[PDB]
């Protein structure tokens, strides 16, 4: 529902409903490069667990 | 109060597939093992220092 409003001229693309109004969708296509982030662990000493 | 009288004891350890294939004849059903699921992090009971 984050897209622009969809009228009746929908060529065939996917859509959704927001507040009674029909809107288009957005899709990610993500690329994650090396050394871009790290998860942060709050360890208890003596062992590694989550 | 005596370790000799104990009926059972259960120990959990970490292993790799090379250790199990070291003795092929002893172990069976190695084909169906879901390796990815039984990661050290996915079992919270086990206590270890592996990152």
From Swiss-Prot, chain A:
Transmembrane segments: none
Entry superkingdom: Viruses
Localization of this protein: Virion
Function field: Assembles, to form an icosahedral capsid with a T=9 symmetry, about 60 nm in diameter, and consisting of 535 capsid proteins.
Name of the protein described by the UniProt record: Major capsid protein
Organism: Enterobacteria phage N4
Gene that encodes it: 56
Residues of the full protein shown: 302 to 351 of 401
From Swiss-Prot, chain B:
Disulfide bridge map: none
Record's subcellular location: Virion
Coiled-coil positions: none
Entry function: Forms the portal vertex of the capsid. This portal plays critical roles in head assembly, genome packaging, neck/tail attachment, and genome ejection. The portal protein multimerizes as a single ring-shaped homododecamer arranged around a central channel.
Record's subunit section: Homododecamer.
Protein name listed in UniProt: Probable portal protein
Organism of derivation: Enterobacteria phage N4 (Bacteriophage N4)
Classification of source organism: Viruses, Duplodnaviria, Heunggongvirae, Uroviricota, Caudoviricetes
């Amino acid at each position: 529902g984050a897209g622009a409003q969809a009228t009746g001229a929908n060529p065939g693309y996917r859509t959704s409903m927001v507040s009674g109004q029909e809107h288009y969708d957005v899709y990610p296509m993500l690329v994650v490069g090396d050394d871009s982030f790290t998860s942060i662990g709050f360890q208890t000493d003596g062992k590694s667990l989550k | 109060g005596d370790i000799n009288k104990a009926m059972f004891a259960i120990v959990s350890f970490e292993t790799c597939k090379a250790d199990l294939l070291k003795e092929k004849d002893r172990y069976h059903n190695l084909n169906k093992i879901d390796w990815q699921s039984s990661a050290p992090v996915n079992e919270p009971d086990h206590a270890t220092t592996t990152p």
